[PDB]
Each structure stands twice: as structure tokens, then as C-alpha cells.
Design an enzyme around this catalytic site. Structure first.
Site, PDB file in Angstrom:
ATOM      1  N   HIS A  57     -46.285  -7.009 -21.093  1.00  0.00           N
ATOM      2  CA  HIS A  57     -46.839  -8.184 -21.491  1.00  0.00           C
ATOM      3  C   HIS A  57     -46.078  -8.880 -22.542  1.00  0.00           C
ATOM      4  CE1 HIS A  57     -50.017  -5.346 -19.732  1.00  0.00           C
ATOM      5  NE2 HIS A  57     -50.081  -6.037 -19.026  1.00  0.00           N
ATOM      6  N   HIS A  69     -45.500  -8.712 -32.365  1.00  0.00           N
ATOM      7  CA  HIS A  69     -45.280  -8.958 -30.900  1.00  0.00           C
ATOM      8  C   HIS A  69     -45.028 -10.616 -30.711  1.00  0.00           C
ATOM      9  CE1 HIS A  69     -49.503  -9.126 -30.700  1.00  0.00           C
ATOM     10  NE2 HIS A  69     -49.399 -10.195 -29.639  1.00  0.00           N
ATOM     11  N   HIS A 125     -45.303 -14.357 -28.083  1.00  0.00           N
ATOM     12  CA  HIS A 125     -45.658 -15.142 -26.997  1.00  0.00           C
ATOM     13  C   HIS A 125     -44.974 -16.280 -26.677  1.00  0.00           C
ATOM     14  CE1 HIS A 125     -49.513 -12.876 -26.579  1.00  0.00           C
ATOM     15  NE2 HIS A 125     -49.608 -13.074 -27.965  1.00  0.00           N
ATOM     16  N   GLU A 161     -49.845 -19.724 -28.491  1.00  0.00           N
ATOM     17  CA  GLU A 161     -51.249 -19.625 -27.916  1.00  0.00           C
ATOM     18  C   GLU A 161     -52.124 -20.391 -28.631  1.00  0.00           C
ATOM     19  OE1 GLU A 161     -51.916 -15.002 -27.814  1.00  0.00           O
ATOM     20  OE2 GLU A 161     -51.874 -16.106 -26.110  1.00  0.00           O
ATOM     21  N   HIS A 199     -47.285 -12.719 -33.585  1.00  0.00           N
ATOM     22  CA  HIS A 199     -48.639 -12.175 -34.046  1.00  0.00           C
ATOM     23  C   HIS A 199     -48.217 -10.646 -34.638  1.00  0.00           C
ATOM     24  CE1 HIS A 199     -51.104 -14.393 -30.832  1.00  0.00           C
ATOM     25  NE2 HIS A 199     -50.689 -15.112 -31.895  1.00  0.00           N
ATOM     26  N   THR A 246     -56.241 -11.844 -27.804  1.00  0.00           N
ATOM     27  CA  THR A 246     -55.918 -13.010 -26.810  1.00  0.00           C
ATOM     28  C   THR A 246     -55.509 -12.278 -25.456  1.00  0.00           C
ATOM     29  OG1 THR A 246     -53.385 -13.019 -27.365  1.00  0.00           O
ATOM     30  CG2 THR A 246     -55.185 -14.484 -28.551  1.00  0.00           C
TER      31      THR A 246
HETATM   32  C1  V8O Z   1     -54.607  -2.508 -32.317  1.00  0.00           C
HETATM   33  C2  V8O Z   1     -54.227  -2.915 -30.825  1.00  0.00           C
HETATM   34  C3  V8O Z   1     -53.947  -4.354 -30.561  1.00  0.00           C
HETATM   35  C4  V8O Z   1     -53.852  -4.845 -29.306  1.00  0.00           C
HETATM   36  C5  V8O Z   1     -53.649  -6.389 -29.125  1.00  0.00           C
HETATM   37  C6  V8O Z   1     -53.898  -7.104 -27.987  1.00  0.00           C
HETATM   38  C7  V8O Z   1     -53.573  -8.508 -28.156  1.00  0.00           C
HETATM   39  C8  V8O Z   1     -53.141  -8.853 -29.390  1.00  0.00           C
HETATM   40  S1  V8O Z   1     -52.979 -10.395 -30.028  1.00  0.00           S
HETATM   41  N1  V8O Z   1     -52.373 -11.270 -28.826  1.00  0.00           N
HETATM   42  O1  V8O Z   1     -52.499 -10.549 -31.321  1.00  0.00           O
HETATM   43  O2  V8O Z   1     -54.379 -10.974 -30.073  1.00  0.00           O
HETATM   44  S2  V8O Z   1     -53.434  -7.354 -30.579  1.00  0.00           S
HETATM   45  C9  V8O Z   1     -53.784  -4.046 -28.424  1.00  0.00           C
HETATM   46  N2  V8O Z   1     -54.071  -2.771 -28.741  1.00  0.00           N
HETATM   47  C10 V8O Z   1     -54.502  -2.280 -29.876  1.00  0.00           C
HETATM   48  C11 V8O Z   1     -54.424  -0.634 -29.795  1.00  0.00           C
HETATM   49  C12 V8O Z   1     -53.667   0.194 -30.659  1.00  0.00           C
HETATM   50  C13 V8O Z   1     -53.810   1.515 -30.671  1.00  0.00           C
HETATM   51  C14 V8O Z   1     -54.886   2.246 -29.781  1.00  0.00           C
HETATM   52  C15 V8O Z   1     -55.942   1.311 -28.916  1.00  0.00           C
HETATM   53  N3  V8O Z   1     -56.865   2.175 -28.373  1.00  0.00           N
HETATM   54  C16 V8O Z   1     -57.347   1.489 -27.638  1.00  0.00           C
HETATM   55  C17 V8O Z   1     -57.573   0.073 -27.455  1.00  0.00           C
HETATM   56  C18 V8O Z   1     -56.514  -0.718 -28.205  1.00  0.00           C
HETATM   57  C19 V8O Z   1     -55.616   0.175 -29.244  1.00  0.00           C
HETATM   58 ZN    ZN Z   2     -50.479 -11.722 -29.381  1.00  0.00          ZN
END
Ligand code: V8O
Ligand code: ZN
Ligand code: V8O
Ligand code: V8O
Ligand code: V8O
Ligand code: ZN
Ligand code: ZN
Ligand code: ZN
Lengths: 260, 260, 260, 260
Positions: A64, A89, A91, A102, A115, A196
Site C-alpha cells: 500500500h 510512510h 502517499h 491526502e 506521515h 486514512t
Molecule cells: C499503528 C498502526 C498504524 C497504521 C496506519 C494506517 C494508516 C495510517 S495513515 N495513512 O498515517 O493514517 S497509520 C496501521 N497499522 C498500525 C498497527 C501497527 C501494529 C499492530 C497493529 N495491530 C492491529 C492493527 C493495526 C496495527
Molecule cells: Zn498515511
């Protein structure tokens, strides 16, 4: 499985990830009608961002985005709790239309967006725990436009050819992550939002810096062309482009600014 | 049931209406990177638009917008087929954020947007069977900005406080619908897209005029405050505000312009 | 053969009623660590709650609470099954410590609690049959805090001095039961639980509204002092006070919220 | 056989241990409505709490807690009788919900709770005789919260991996138990209550210190994850978590404070 294009694209996220059709969704357009100065907002202080050159940090294509792991001894001061870094990371858009931030400002997309994700390390042991809980996450967002060559961003981009496909990984030597941030960090937008990407948990406190950073024409084209969303042998390879969510409705709610 | 707010809102349309998560969705942002001049695009002619003053036309609050019924002897000349009118309606924002157009230009929301809906009467016997078929629909879009009072728009708006609630109807004396159109209708954006509401059928040839019309602050406020999505006696009314869809991804395609 | 005080009190209920020492017991403390946002929780509709003012409804002192019988044409819409109303009643403390809600929020008791009890009328023929069966019951809980006078609650509380003793009955004219509910009923906690009184059957889908209602200091005191658990001619009267269960263990489980 | 979870859990204790359904039960919520300042309450003096480093003290997993045996030459002065020590032990929650004190303060659970158990050595020859007799026992309770690392509590925690299962035992060299007590021990809550585990004898004079002590995240997680309720040879192992009793009704009774 979710994508930024076609049948599993963002209008369909809500099917398997109900929160994507829920409250406090991000990103948003930052425009005058929903802004409000808050004189009580203090500057963030960035601690342990100067990562040692003798240490190394894991870079990952997760299908992604490209992701750099960050140590929990890296943290922000200036929120209600201490937040510790977990990853950063990016975008971006595509060569024909190089506008893939974004967040937008007065309806304008930037070239790309950085981000830097943090978790509440006073309340919670790890990012996993923190992700689906109140006060869970704090994300810093940097807006990126086209301009002069950025030796700091190239500490990431010089490694992209080693993470071309989903699941691939590479080590980066520690550098000063603070170099990734813009001029006058004191000036920012702040609001309560979400991830997001799926699962879109509404657990993020957003800080979007007012001032953009610059990367070269060449650096941006490199980022837009380097990566694929698919593993080393999916029959149907897919390029990693347009990996940003459209801006969300933001009604009877407020974004607080640290500037007037 | 669908809405523009909450669990039945646009991110969840795809769960009841599959096309809302498919291809060719509207509306879109019109910006340079996806525009191309096409000199073959000729002026439309608006025929039978000068409605008989001695006839009356049904205005309805349908819970999603306000809609005026139009006669089949009204049609667009200059497409591959004749397209006959079926209805017109509007989209708008709210008094706190009065930027509720569907289409945007270089990121910028206009105050409101007018849609004149037509069906391919050469190929199909009615709008109903045209709606979800190839070459079925053509919609004319007029972007609306706040400024000068508009007598012609007021021939519709003067009836608003008499259709405040869902299901209510009023009659509008015939008038010249061409007076709702902006200056230099020869100048327009053209592209293949979809209904911007469920069912989101990807059957629409879009014509968005280059130039906006103006209505008064007073006209806009009436539009933004007069109408409710709910029936008259519902204990908990819901205001009809922000009844526009966010812009959609538009990648690997072009919008064609009749102006350079 | 049970009380809320002394040897027949709640720690001994399990000696007489097996389910009171079983699984999924209510009530519970609602606190951040066991809350999870769930966008799938949409608003209930309260249908037939506007009871005919030309009809009357039996109010009873049953020696444990004060109970209002409700008609089966009254129901909740929006769950998997229709749940039809059977009665409402209350729980409260005492003038020396007026914090007698059953559910707590972050450890804090409210003054009192209203339960509106319903049975699964799609699956089952009456409340008697549903009471001890799968998906048998659904209870709405309103947290009550001491504050402004409430005219709607007083439609009940005005009859309290005519049902002072166990077995005594009064008639209450029909009024709109929705007036007993708080602001923003769309905001609630949801979890699978049990009757809070013997026989403690684990058959209840609980909805606790997020926002409290207020009743006056005088209304609260009347509720806490009007009623007895004993019959009229009993020379040893026992006051009906502190008729609430303590919160139960809630481990390996989550409460789902419609708000974040 | 008794447990803190499932069918042999606390609502069923009364079946074989009648006093658990009896008078004067502990623990309780300490809140303003049931507190009363008592100027005659005097500070405890702690005698022989600095245990010889040359002697050994038995640490045991008893299936309900971890227990450290204490010598009777350890005593409290400041009560009506001399009370001499017999054991200390702890209560805690679980990693997802690290709030497992027994007593609460204005509805707030602390992370954990320490109990130092003493028996009335003026009236009785040993703790066993004392346990179920008038004026038999005095327990000190220290509330524990997450904060800085605590090297004094680690004199216990560093031996936990040697008593992981029920029945397992380890010797601990003497340390100063007074190091486990908080600041300003002169400020406390006092009330007449009970053992908080079966047989729930109502023979305990409780002193709960006003001020908590701090232990680190890692120490608390260590404590919550180290131990099992079951023997080495149990096919159905159970983690020792949530080993605290819910708060009890406290009607028509007073807690006395040494501070105003
Ligand atoms: C802390 C974290 C942020 C993210 C993010 C997704 C998208 C963003 S963003 N585009 O900055 O908003 S940050 C995804 N996974 C985790 C994550 C990190 C580590 C373990 C996890 N376990 C379950 C669900 C999510 C976990
Ligand atoms: Zn992001
Ligand atoms: C052709 C048509 C378009 C629409 C539209 C919905 C949204 C638009 S917009 N926002 O211009 O894209 S146009 C609504 N109703 C009809 C319509 C008009 C007349 C009869 C119909 N019968 C069945 C289904 C739809 C019928
Ligand atoms: C369904 C039902 C629930 C209850 C409840 C007891 C306690 C609650 S509470 N405190 O809401 O959890 S609701 C009482 N009576 C009936 C009931 C209602 C009607 C007929 C019945 N026949 C036999 C047994 C119970 C009957
Ligand atoms: C085993 C025991 C537990 C307790 C306690 C149980 C629970 C507590 S607590 N959670 O501090 O209230 S203290 C007190 N004294 C004795 C005790 C200690 C020593 C010998 C005994 N003989 C018979 C009965 C009890 C004896
Ligand atoms: Zn439209
Ligand atoms: Zn109840
Ligand atoms: Zn204890």
C-alpha cells in the site's frame, strides 16, 4: 484485501471495514470556513529523532505504501501524553497527474505527503494495543511539493529499488528524521480524525504542518515509478500509484490552527 | 435508504448500490492535468426550453433534493442522439460552509450546482429504461456562485417555503429554462460519467458549462435553510444540507473542453 | 425469595437462582479499556411509544421496584428481530447516598436507572416464553442524574404515593415514552448480558444510552422515600432503597459503542 | 474450590463459604458520601519491618495470589491491641485492562493492591486461631499505580519465575517491608470489614493508605503475566489474572479518615 483502484477501491472499503464509513474520517480539505485559531496550542518538541548512523531501521513495501520502522525511544512532547514513534510512510499520485497528497489546503493537492505515526506510550505498551483505542495514535503530516533536491528525503528514496515488490524489505542506516520536517513546525493544523487506510479507526490526533517541504522533479518521479502493490510474482502486477484517499466530508466540526 | 450523512452516507452507498463503487463515477475535479481541448465539440442547441407560461410544472421535495419535472418536448440538439428532458434539481452546502457544488474547478467548490437531466429518446422510450443502459442519459451542469440576485432561479426558489418537507409538491408556471444557463454555453467540459446519487449508474454524458451563474446570498440561504429530508410531523427533523457527493478518482482518462 | 440487603442479598442470589452465578451477568462498568467503536451500530426506532392518552396502564409495587406495564404494539425497530415492550421499572439508592444506577461509567454511579424491557416477538409468543431463551430479551437503559425537574418522569412519579406497599396498583394515563429517553439516542453502548434481578437469565441484549436525563432533587427524594418492600399492615416495614445490583466481572469481552 | 472467574467465581462463594454472603464484607468503594473524619485516629508505628537479610521468608503461589510469609516479631502499634504479621500478598488485573485493585477511590480502580495481613497477638496465640474470632485480624492495604520503576517491589517480583504454578515455593531473603509502604502513612481510611477471599470472615480491621505507590509498566506487566492458578500437572491451565473481588454494598455504615 483493499486497494486504491477498481472494485476493492475506497468507495467499497466500508464493506469489510465498517469504520471507513464511520465517524471522524480523514483526510480533509483545510479551508477557512472550518478553521479556528487556538492560542493554547504549543509547539511540538521532537526527541530522539536523530537516529544513530551505526544503527539501522527496517524499510518495507507493505503493498500500500513504503514504510520505515521507527524506535519507541523516538517521541513527541507537547500533547496530553507522551507519544512514541512506530513508523513513517508516504502517499503519492502518478506521473501524468503528480498531485497525490491526502490533505488539501484551500482545495489544492500537493505532490505527496509524509506521515509519521506515533502511539500513546504512557497509556499503552505498543502500537497494536493503541491503534483501536481512545487517545490511541498521533500522526504528523508533512506536505510535499516540487522544487529543489532534498538530500534528506533521498536517504529514503535511494533505497526504493530494494523494496520494489510487496513483502520486500531493506535496512536504512539511522539519519535525522527531523530533517524531513518543514520550516516553522510551530505553525500547524490540528483536528481529531482517523487512519486514512482500512481499518480507518477514528483514533488519530492529526497534526498537519502549515509549511511544505520540497523534493526535486526527479525524486518525485522516482517515488511514483519505483514500487508495485503486488508480490514478486503475482500474475497481474500492479504499480503503486495514486495511493491516497479522497478528502472526506467535515461538517459541523472544527480544525484548530496554531497560527492566525 | 440513502443519505449524505451518517451510516447511510456516501462511503456506504456501495453496500446497497454496487455501481457506486464501480467505474466512471461522478463528480470530478476539473484541473489542467486531465483536460484536453477538442475543437470538434460544437455548441448545443436548447429546443423547447421556453416552457409555455400557460402550463404548470411539478416541484417536489423528494427527501434528497428539490426537483422540477420537465416535459419531453424539451431536448438537446447536437449530440449523436436527441436527448429529451426529464427533470432538474440542485445540490448545495450549508450556511457555515456555503460551497456545495458537486464538480470542482482547480480544487474550488462553487456555492451550488444545477443539473438538467435528459434521456436518449432516439434509442429508448422513457427515462426509466434509458437510466441504466448504454448512451442512456445526458446531464447539463451549471455551477452556481454567490453574488447577484437571479430572477430566473427565483421562479423556482420562490416556491421553496411551500415544499419544506419530504413528499410535498408545488406547481411552477412555465418559464424559459435557458435563462438558468450561464453566458457562452458554447464553452463547456465534456466527459463520460455516472449519476452522482444512487444507483450511480455509469450511463451519463456530462456537459459542465465553463462559466458560473450568480444567485444572491439571500437566495442561497433560502436554499440552504428551507428544506428538510424528513416528513412534516417526524419528531426528529433532519435538515437538507450538504447534499453533494465528494469528487471521485479520475485516472487514465481525459475531460474534453470546447474552449482552449 | 430475595433482597438487596442482608442474608437474602445479592451474594446469595446464586443459592436460589443458578443463573445469578453464571456467565454474561449484568450490570457492568463502562470504561475505556473494554470499549470499542463499531460503525455497524445504527439508530434504533421507537415505534408505538406514543401511548394513547385515552388509555391507562397498570403501575405496580412488586416489592422489588415500581413497574409500569406496557403494550405489545410498542416496539424497537432496527435490531435483527422485532422486540416488543412488556414493562418499564427503575433502580435507585437512598437519601444518604443517592447514587443507585446499575451501570457505572468510568467507575461513577448515576442517581438512578430506567429499564424499558422488551421481548423477541419474532421468535417467541410472549415475554414469559422468551425470558429464558436465546435472544429472548432486549432492555433499554437510561442513566438518571439529579438536576432539572422532568415533567415526563413525573407522569410516573406523581402516582408513587398510591403504590407505597407491596402488591398495590395504580393506573397511569398514556404518554409518550420517548420523552423518557435522553438526547442523541443514536449514541449508545451495546453488549450481551443478563437480567439484573433473579432469575438473572443471560438472555438480554443491552443498549445503554450514552447521555443521561435529569430529574429534580425533589423527584429523586420521592422515588427514594415513597415505597416499601413490605405489605401495608406489616408492623415491621422495610423501605425500598438501594434496589440496584453491584457491577459484575467483565473479562474476555467488549462493549461496542456507536460513538467514539 | 473457589476462583475469580466462571461457575466457582465470586457470586457462588456463599454456597460453601456462608460468610461471603454475610455482614461487613470487603472491599468497598471509598467515596465522599460514606467518609467521616475522626480526629482520634493515630498513626501506626511499624516494628520489626526491617527483616534480617540473613533470614529467609517463604514465597508461595497458593493458586489465588502470590504470598510471602511474615514473622510474628513484625507488628503494628497504634491499634487497641498489638497485631503481629503473618503474610503479605497482591491483587491485580490483566494486560488489556491493568486496573485490578480491590478497593476503589471515588470509583477509580488502581493498577493493583498490596495487603499486609496481621493477627491479634494480645488476644490469640496464632493467626489460625485469630482468623475467625472477634478482633482477629488487621490488614494494611497499599494502592499501586503505574509510574517509575520501584526497586523495593522488585525484591518480590524478581522471584516470580520460581513460583509460576500452584504449590510452588521459593525462599526470599529479608528486606525492609516498610519500603513497600507509601508516603505519609499517617493519612488513611479505616473501617470494619472482612477477608476479601473465602472464607470471607468479618474479622478484619482495615487500614487503606490514602497515597498510592508507583511501579513501572514492565513490573506491572511482569506481575500480570508470570503466574498460573493451576498445578504443574493441570491439563486445563488458568492464568492468574483479575484476582480481585468486586466492591461490596456498604449500607448504613461508615469509613473513618485520619485526614480532613
Ligand atoms: C499503528 C498502526 C498504524 C497504521 C496506519 C494506517 C494508516 C495510517 S495513515 N495513512 O498515517 O493514517 S497509520 C496501521 N497499522 C498500525 C498497527 C501497527 C501494529 C499492530 C497493529 N495491530 C492491529 C492493527 C493495526 C496495527
Ligand atoms: Zn498515511
Ligand atoms: C433518469 C433519472 C436520473 C436520476 C438522477 C439521479 C441523480 C442525477 S445527477 N445528480 O444529475 O447525477 S440524475 C433520477 N431519476 C431518473 C428517473 C426519471 C424518470 C423515471 C425513472 N424511473 C426509474 C428510475 C429513474 C428514473
Ligand atoms: C421478561 C421479563 C423480564 C423481567 C426482568 C427482571 C429484571 C430486569 S432488568 N433489571 O431490566 O434487567 S427485566 C421481569 N419479568 C419478565 C416477565 C414478563 C412477563 C411475563 C413473565 N412471565 C414469567 C417470567 C417473567 C416474565
Ligand atoms: C490462610 C489465611 C488467609 C488469610 C486471608 C485471606 C484473604 C485476605 S485479604 N485478601 O487480605 O483480605 S487475608 C488470613 N489468614 C490466614 C491464615 C493464616 C495462617 C493459618 C490459618 N489457619 C486457618 C485459617 C486461616 C489461616
Ligand atoms: Zn444532480
Ligand atoms: Zn432493571
Ligand atoms: Zn488480599
Amino acid at each position: 484485501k483493499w486497494t486504491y483502484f477498481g472494485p476493492d477501491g475506497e468507495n467499497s472499503w466500508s464493506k469489510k471495514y465498517p469504520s471507513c464509513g464511520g465517524l471522524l474520517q480523514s483526510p480533509i480539505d483545510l479551508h477557512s470556513d472550518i478553521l479556528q485559531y487556538d492560542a493554547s496550542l504549543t509547539p511540538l518538541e521532537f526527541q530522539g529523532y536523530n537516529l544513530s548512523a551505526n544503527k539501522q531501521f527496517l524499510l518495507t513495501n507493505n503493498g500500500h505504501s513504503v514504510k520505515l520502522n521507527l524506535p519507541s525511544d523516538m517521541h513527541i512532547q507537547g500533547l496530553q501524553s507522551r507519544y512514541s514513534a512506530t513508523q513513517l510512510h508516504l502517499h503519492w499520485g502518478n506521473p501524468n497527474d503528480p498531485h497525490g497528497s491526502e490533505h488539501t489546503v484551500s482545495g489544492q493537492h500537493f505532490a505527496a505527503e509524509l506521515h509519521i505515526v506515533h502511539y500513546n506510550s504512557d497509556l499503552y505498551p505498543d502500537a497494536s494495543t493503541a491503534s483501536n483505542k481512545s487517545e490511541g495514535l498521533a500522526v504528523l503530516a508533512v506536505l510535499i511539493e516540487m522544487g529543489s533536491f532534498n538530500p534528506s528525503y533521498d536517504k529514503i528514496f535511494s533505497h526504493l529499488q530494494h523494496v520494489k515488490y510487496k513483502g520486500q524489505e531493506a535496512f536504512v542506516p539511522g539519519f535525522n528524521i527531523e530533517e524531513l520536517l518543514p520550516e516553522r513546525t510551530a505553525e500547524y493544523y490540528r483536528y481529531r480524525g482517523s487512519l486514512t487506510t482500512p481499518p480507518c479507526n477514528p483514533t488519530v490526533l492529526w497534526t498537519v504542518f502549515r509549511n511544505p517541504v520540497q523534493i526535486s522533479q526527479e525524486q518525485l518521479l522516482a517515488l511514483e515509478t519505483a514500487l508495485y502493490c503486488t508480490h514478486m510474482d503475482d500474475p497481474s502486477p500492479r504499480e503503486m500509484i495514486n495511493n491516497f484517499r479522497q478528502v472526506q466530508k467535515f461538517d459541523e466540526r472544527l480544525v484548530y490552527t496554531s497560527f492566525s
